[PDB]
């Protein structure tokens, strides 16, 4: 379930750079965190974000 | 930012970009050697970049400087969001130029309906994503609490403003966090968060640094 969150920035406007794993691609894909709040579905790189949710 | 334009190079000399690799956040020079910024932008190490316009062309004429001292306001909750501010001494003075000067700090709290500059090198998309290189310039009102307590109910703390366009399309957004708001040559406002970017009724809240002015003052006399 955590896998199958869409992609959440959080409402703070940072650009901390992660990893979501986008459903539509069966793979993880980068996006900015901004910092605060956002959901489950969110990895600091690329292969951790695979290895939860690949 | 959405909805804005590109600045004129070199001409908000104040804007510092947060780099750790990457370009993360913005920044205020408010001194030789401190910097303001909002404290979720925290990382343990930060490079600042000084006189920039293009964040990915080294022109020559920026400085980079390490931080040495990195602090967030001590209540900073990232729950709530209060006290959405940071301080960072840099390890040597800026050296103050045309490219790369001091902004002033508020004397007053924030005017409804006053026109104030918010700068950053954010998300130009309110869905999708593109990041410019380029430091783009947003013209915003502030807009009444009334507006911003209305557009966030029970969110809008006393450390909390708004600026912007309650019709959409106009906004900071992801990677601007940190960065100026400018109104009458003064520093009120850093780039803190919002619902979304640029979408209707749901506008930018700034921290309200006029509310930090003693914090500013006395972080600054203990860490010299
Ligand atoms: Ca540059």
Redesign the interface.
């Known amino acids: 379930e955590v896998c199958s969150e869409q992609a959440e920035?959080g409402?703070?406007?940072?650009?901390?750079?992660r990893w979501y794993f986008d459903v539509t691609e069966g793979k993880c894909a980068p996006?900015?965190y901004?910092?605060?709040?956002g959901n489950r579905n969110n990895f600091d790189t690329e292969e951790y974000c695979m290895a939860v949710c690949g | 930012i959405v909805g804005g334009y590109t600045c004129e190079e070199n001409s908000l000399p104040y804007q510092v970009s947060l780099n750790s690799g990457?370009?993360?956040?913005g920044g205020s020079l408010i001194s030789e050697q401190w910097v303001v910024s909002?404290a979720?932008?925290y990382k343990t190490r930060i490079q600042v970049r000084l006189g920039e316009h293009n964040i990915k062309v080294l022109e020559g004429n920026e400085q980079f400087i390490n931080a040495a001292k990195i602090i967030r306001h001590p209540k900073y909750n990232?729950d709530t969001?209060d006290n959405?501010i940071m301080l960072i001494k840099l390890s040597s003075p800026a050296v103050i130029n045309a490219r790369v000067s001091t902004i002033s700090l508020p004397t007053a709290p924030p005017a409804a309906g006053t026109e104030c500059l918010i700068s950053g090198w954010?998300?130009t998309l309110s869905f999708g994503?593109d990041?410019p290189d380029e430091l783009k310039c947003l013209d915003a009102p502030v807009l009444t609490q009334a507006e911003c307590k209305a557009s966030y109910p029970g969110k809008i703390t006393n450390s909390m403003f708004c600026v912007g366009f309650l019709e959409g399309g106009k906004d900071?957004?992801?990677?601007?966090?940190?960065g100026p708001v400018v109104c009458n040559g003064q520093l009120q406002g850093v780039?803190?968060?919002?619902?979304g970017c640029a979408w209707k009724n749901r506008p930018g809240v700034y921290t309200k640094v006029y509310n930090y002015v003693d914090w500013i003052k006395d972080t600054i006399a203990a860490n010299s």
């Open positions: 920035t409402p703070c406007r940072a650009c901390f750079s996006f900015c901004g910092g605060c709040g | 990457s370009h993360f956040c909002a979720h932008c990232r969001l959405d954010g998300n994503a990041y900071s957004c992801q990677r601007d966090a940190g780039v803190s968060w919002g619902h």
